[PDB]
Design an enzyme around this catalytic site. Structure first.
Site, short mmCIF file in Angstrom:
data_model
loop_
_atom_site.label_atom_id
_atom_site.label_comp_id
_atom_site.label_asym_id
_atom_site.label_seq_id
_atom_site.Cartn_x
_atom_site.Cartn_y
_atom_site.Cartn_z
N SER A 104 45.11 37.72 45.54
CA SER A 104 45.58 38.74 46.47
C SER A 104 46.54 38.21 47.53
O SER A 104 46.42 38.59 48.69
CB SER A 104 44.38 39.39 47.17
OG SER A 104 43.38 39.80 46.26
N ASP A 110 46.48 41.60 43.51
CA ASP A 110 45.44 42.63 43.48
C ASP A 110 46.05 44.02 43.41
O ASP A 110 45.44 44.92 42.83
CB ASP A 110 44.50 42.49 44.67
CG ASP A 110 45.21 42.61 46.00
OD1 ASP A 110 46.38 42.19 46.10
OD2 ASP A 110 44.60 43.14 46.95
N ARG A 126 34.98 38.21 43.92
CA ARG A 126 34.00 38.67 42.96
C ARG A 126 34.32 38.11 41.59
O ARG A 126 35.48 37.86 41.25
CB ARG A 126 33.92 40.22 42.92
CG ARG A 126 35.20 40.94 43.30
CD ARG A 126 35.15 42.43 42.94
NE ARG A 126 34.12 43.19 43.66
CZ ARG A 126 33.49 44.25 43.15
NH1 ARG A 126 33.78 44.67 41.93
NH2 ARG A 126 32.57 44.88 43.86
#
Ligand SMILES: Nc1ncnc2c1ncn2[C@@H]1O[C@H](COP(=O)(O)OP(=O)(O)O)[C@@H](O)[C@H]1O
Ligand SMILES: [Mg+2]
Length: 465
Positions: free
Chosen positions: A147, A200, A78
């Site tokens: 992440s 993340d 995102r």
């Protein structure tokens, strides 16, 4: 039926191998802490990497300005954009766009991965509306959530250690992930500087504390699992620089790589690891995480279908396919409450390609989902317990006065959308804590909180302009 006792023996060894009595969970939590200490003193062969994140000051609220964030992402990525107002106004405006990662881009060329995500960031800043203002001459600044485990070298630079959860791109291990993204943004004619690089877990913890002062840790339970917490910088033997002004440091534990002989593993786990993209790695995650739960169920159902003719006297072709039973499918079946399990059965028709299923076959399937989700959720609670023990929050005040409030931010589609998993996680954690200690621990949902958290850490590390 003979076929009935042969099925009971399979289910009986699953219950036996997967068993997680609370006593075992406390020993696992102890082993987690033992491993946290090893990773913090840079022990060789440490399963937990316990990565210094270079985040010494979590968000305070006084952040202000316009900042973008790029969040990647096991299954999606995102692009976020916020206009920060300060201690009183806060997030004035916010916009985001989420994109699903095409499967090939997980296992191809790193230039293809970063070209794809940088191209979506390009068209995203090009639609920057009027609610977001950039002073003249200034350069737009980015927070990058990556992440995957990164050997951090600064607040905004870091080397990829290894890929996880379905990713496997040659030629990135050892490379700076921020430089790799910076080059791709350049190839797109894009003026942005990455001023913060975070895992993340570290980002969710940043975004969590921005809205709740007592957030002490962040646990991710999505396609993969991991956790970060705030540690005392004088409690990290491997630290060699000065010492942070705040005496604090966020650690990315990378706890999916936890392994312990106390972990209740089975042959199904050995086979799953043997045929996996990263064999031998992420043993703990492969019992908890969303990418692997349904696959454990499939391997148990396959054993039953073969040794007990559970789905007919011929094993369904589709059932032998790896990863055909996704974890959201497991979740759908698990929550069926109808008397005849018609929705579990409807899902089994799609996934197995069979015409029909016994009521008895449906209840066995429901029981297998139960055993697999229960083991994952209880072990994940044991991990959170281990963190609380590290921060000395497993126990309340002895002086008998003043209970602390400890908040743990949670993120990921597993925790958010798998109802039975979540409630089993929280029940076991409360069980592991006392009744006295549990009333002091908060499990807050901070879904996709690494987006705004990465933007906030990019803010407090601006250039400026
Ligand atoms: N309904 C569901 N039941 C169980 N697991 C789910 C469900 N929905 C999503 N998940 C898991 O959560 C993951 C998506 O979570 P998210 O945190 O958004 O992405 P990622 O963890 O891949 O970055 C999926 O890969 C899936 O494993
Ligand atoms: Mg999501």
């Amino acid at each position: 039926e003979e076929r009935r006792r042969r099925a009971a023996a399979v289910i009986e060894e699953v219950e036996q191998r997967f068993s997680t009595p609370t006593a075992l969970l406390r020993g696992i939590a102890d082993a987690m802490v033992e491993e946290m200490e090893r990773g913090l003193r840079a022990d060789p062969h440490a399963p937990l990497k316990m990565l210094i994140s270079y985040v010494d000051n979590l968000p305070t609220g006084d952040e202000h300005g316009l900042f973008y964030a790029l969040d990647l992402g096991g299954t999606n990525f995102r692009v976020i954009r916020v206009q920060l107002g300060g201690r009183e106004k806060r997030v004035v405006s916010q916009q985001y766009e989420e994109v699903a990662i095409p499967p090939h881009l997980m296992v191809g060329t790193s230039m293809e991965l970063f070209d794809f995500i940088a191209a979506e960031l390009e068209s995203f800043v090009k639609t920057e509306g009027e609610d977001f203002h950039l002073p003249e001459g200034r350069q737009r600044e980015l927070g990058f959530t990556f992440s995957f485990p990164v050997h951090q070298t600064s607040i905004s630079s870091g080397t990829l250690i290894k890929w996880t959860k379905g990713f496997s791109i040659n030629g990135t291990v050892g490379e700076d992930v921020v430089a790799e993204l910076s080059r791709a943004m350049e190839r797109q004619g894009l003026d942005m500087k990455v001023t913060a690089l975070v895992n993340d877990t570290v980002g969710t913890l940043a975004g969590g504390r921005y809205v709740d002062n007592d957030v002490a840790a962040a646990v991710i339970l999505g396609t993969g699992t991991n956790a970060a917490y705030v540690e005392h910088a004088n409690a990290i033997p491997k630290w060699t620089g000065l010492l942070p002004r705040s005496g604090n440091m966020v650690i990315n534990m990378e706890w999916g790589n936890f392994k312990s002989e106390r972990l209740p593993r089975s042959d199904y786990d050995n086979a799953l690891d043997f045929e996996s993209l990263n064999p031998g790695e992420q043993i703990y995650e492969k019992m908890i995480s969303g990418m692997y739960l349904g696959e454990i169920v499939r391997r148990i159902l396959l054993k039953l279908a073969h040794d007990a003719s559970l789905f007919g006297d011929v094993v369904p072709t589709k059932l032998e396919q790896r990863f055909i039973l996704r974890t959201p499918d497991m979740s759908a079946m698990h929550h069926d409450t109808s008397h005849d399990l018609k929705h579990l059965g409807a899902k089994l028709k799609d996934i197995l390609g069979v015409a029909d299923t016994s009521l008895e076959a449906r209840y066995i399937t429901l029981h297998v989902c139960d055993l697999v989700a229960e083991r994952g959720a209880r072990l994940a609670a044991a991990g959170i317990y281990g963190i609380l023990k590290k921060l000395g929050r497993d126990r309340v005040p002895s002086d008998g006065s003043q209970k602390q409030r400890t908040v743990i931010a949670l993120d990921g589609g597993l925790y958010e959308h798998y109802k039975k998993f979540r409630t089993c996680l929280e029940a076991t954690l409360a069980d592991l804590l006392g009744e006295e200690a549990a009333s002091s621990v908060v499990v807050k949902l901070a879904n996709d909180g690494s987006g705004i958290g990465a933007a906030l850490l990019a803010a407090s590390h601006s250039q400026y302009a």
